[PDB]
Design a protein around this ligand. Structure first.
Ligand SMILES: CCOc1ccc(S(=O)(=O)O)c2ccccc12
Ligand SMILES: CCOc1ccc(S(=O)(=O)O)c2ccccc12
Ligand SMILES: [Ca+2]
Ligand SMILES: [Ca+2]
Lengths: 206, 206
């Protein structure tokens, strides 16, 4: 009857919840491994499942945020990507905003990732010859470490796209620090229902 | 190590297999219920999961075919949709081709659905004033019941878009016969892992 349709819709929301956790775990692994194409396909799958979910728990929203964060980080050098309704916000600025919104511990790693994203948000503009855009990214991002802030401005003004500072704080560094965080998310999600049940099936055939 | 990555990829294929069965079941229910928007969102989810699957069992391929069939049937009046690399194949012709490919029993219902799709493949062209396209659909579809074939041609030639024959064999009739088939697919898939586990969770909270 009508209650059977409600029970079906509830079961659908439970399965969508399990699918979201599995797809996050898969997306995190793909990011960690540098499996570009798998990340792209899993991102499409995760977005599709999320559009079929109406009520989100606090943990599911954090999970969605992490997926959006890693997507924006991966698209960090793609200045043609628009991740926000405001067309001016670059992908690394968008990632920084989500990083500042996640309900997570503000540990040392957190601040290192944050500072690395800020530096690289400017650097990727410099590297594309977008000098006026680097200044605008700078003003939106920056209260903050004055010495740090000043150095960047100098570099922007000097228009030295290839400056040594960005080597000490390279995109790679930003990626490796983010991958260490992804490793901790993976430990927490490797125990979710779908992955756990799929792993037991694989282990029973060995 | 490298075998852990292989075990992870295997577990991913197992979970993708379970997700495909659940999404088919969800798509079938949405079609049966006339839940247009849910069908659209679930279709996006099912397509995304399928792009992340490499090895398909015979049963998974039949499942994919049913999803593609119901999608083309739902888009039957959308003559702007191109479902095949050949731009001339209308959605109902595309659905008819998949219907002729499914590894399923050729029972009475099967042939009724098939004949109803053939009639409606012509009717939806007539209804749009696409008289030359109805003739071309006719020649591609039609060996076949000569009386049946002849009547259609007469109607096409008479250009009577609104002809009584199509009432006796309406799009609705085609939809209701297809919904009876969907009801049998639902019984077969309501027992799959994801739906079964999600239903037990919902039932334990009652
Ligand atoms: C609410 C739908 O979900 C998403 C929307 C947008 C993006 S993004 O624009 O590509 O960042 C996602 C990226 C990953 C996972 C889910 C996403
Ligand atoms: C192989 C990817 O999967 C699909 C591809 C295309 C369509 S369709 O064009 O919309 O028919 C699907 C429709 C439903 C389910 C999966 C589909
Ligand atoms: Ca841009
Ligand atoms: Ca057309």
């Amino acid at each position: 009857e009508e209650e059977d349709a409600g029970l079906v819709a509830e079961a659908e929301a439970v399965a969508a919840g399990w699918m979201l956790d599995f797809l996050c775990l898969s997306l995190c692994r793909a990011f960690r491994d540098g499996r570009s194409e798998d990340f792209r396909r899993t991102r499409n799958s995760a977005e599709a499942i999320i559009h079929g979910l109406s009520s989100l728990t606090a943990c599911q929203l954090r999970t969605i945020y992490i997926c959006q964060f890693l997507t924006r980080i991966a698209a960090g050098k793609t200045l043609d990507a628009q991740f926000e309704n405001d067309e001016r916000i670059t992908p690394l600025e968008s990632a920084l905003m989500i990083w500042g919104s996640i309900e997570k511990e503000h540990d040392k790693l957190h601040e290192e990732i944050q500072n690395l994203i800020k530096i690289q948000a400017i650097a990727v503009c410099m590297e594309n010859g977008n000098f006026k855009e680097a200044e605008e990214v700078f003003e939106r991002i920056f209260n903050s470490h004055m010495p740090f802030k000043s150095k960047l401005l100098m570099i922007i003004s000097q228009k030295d796209t290839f400056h040594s500072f960005f080597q000490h704080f390279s995109y790679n560094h930003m990626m490796e620090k983010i991958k260490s965080y992804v490793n901790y998310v993976l430990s927490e999600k490797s125990s979710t229902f779908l992955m756990k049940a799929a792993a037991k099936v694989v282990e029973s055939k060995r």
